[PDB]
């Protein structure tokens, strides 16, 4: 679920999902179009594609379970949708962590008109 993803993001990065990642660049928090602005935005692009691989799943609301094995995220078995959603979220949280070194506040609340063009998954 979105709330679980937000908790995972905070655990991983030390940043609150809202507002650090809810309106960032062209793909974080609201998706759509444009060339991703930087590595963090590319994490969101891929996360959006990942959810897009699951047409008949409901990532915003469906809850999954996971544990930590030392720092590693381990998705625990639930329904097939839950397992796949968890793997999408885990990857995005790791990606955000890997790209904190280039996170830029200038991309928070990024305006929609600066995001044009389709980028295929
Ligand atoms: C799980 N749902 C999909 C359709 C709305 C959502 C979120 C999707 O893509 C996103 O993760 C983005 C954030 O990057 C998002 C946009 C708008 C609302 C919630 C999430 C796929």
* Structural domains in the chain plus CATH codes: 1-121 (1.20.90.10)
Residue 87, classified by CB atoms within 10 Å of its CB into exposed (0-12), middle (13-18) or buried (19+), is middle
Phi first, then psi: give them for residue 39, nearest 5 degrees.
Answer: -60, -40
Q: Which residue, judged by its Cα, is nearest atom 9 of ligand 1?
A: 48
The catalytic residue positions are: 47, 89
Resolution in A: 1.2
Alpha helices in the chain (DSSP H): 2-13, 17-20, 39-52, 80-98
Q: Per the annotation, does 110 bind a ligand?
A: no
Q: Which residues line ligand 1 (CB under 6 A)?
A: 27-31, 44, 47-48, 51, 59-60
Instruction: Choose among 96, 99, 75, 72: nearest CA to 86.
Output: 75
Experimental method: X-ray
């Amino acid at each position: 679920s979105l709330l679980e993803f937000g908790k995972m993001i905070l655990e991983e990065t030390g940043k609150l999902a809202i507002p650090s990642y809810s309106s960032y660049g062209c793909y974080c928090g609201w998706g759509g179009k444009g060339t991703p602005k930087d590595a963090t935005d590319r994490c969101c692009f891929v996360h959006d594609c990942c959810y897009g691989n699951l047409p008949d799943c409901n990532p915003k609301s469906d809850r999954y379970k996971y544990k930590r094995v030392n720092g590693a995220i381990v998705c625990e078995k639930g329904t097939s949708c839950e397992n796949r959603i968890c793997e999408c979220d885990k990857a995005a949280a790791i990606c955000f962590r890997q790209n904190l070194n280039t996170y830029s506040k200038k991309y928070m609340l990024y305006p929609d008109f600066l995001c044009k063009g389709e980028l295929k998954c």
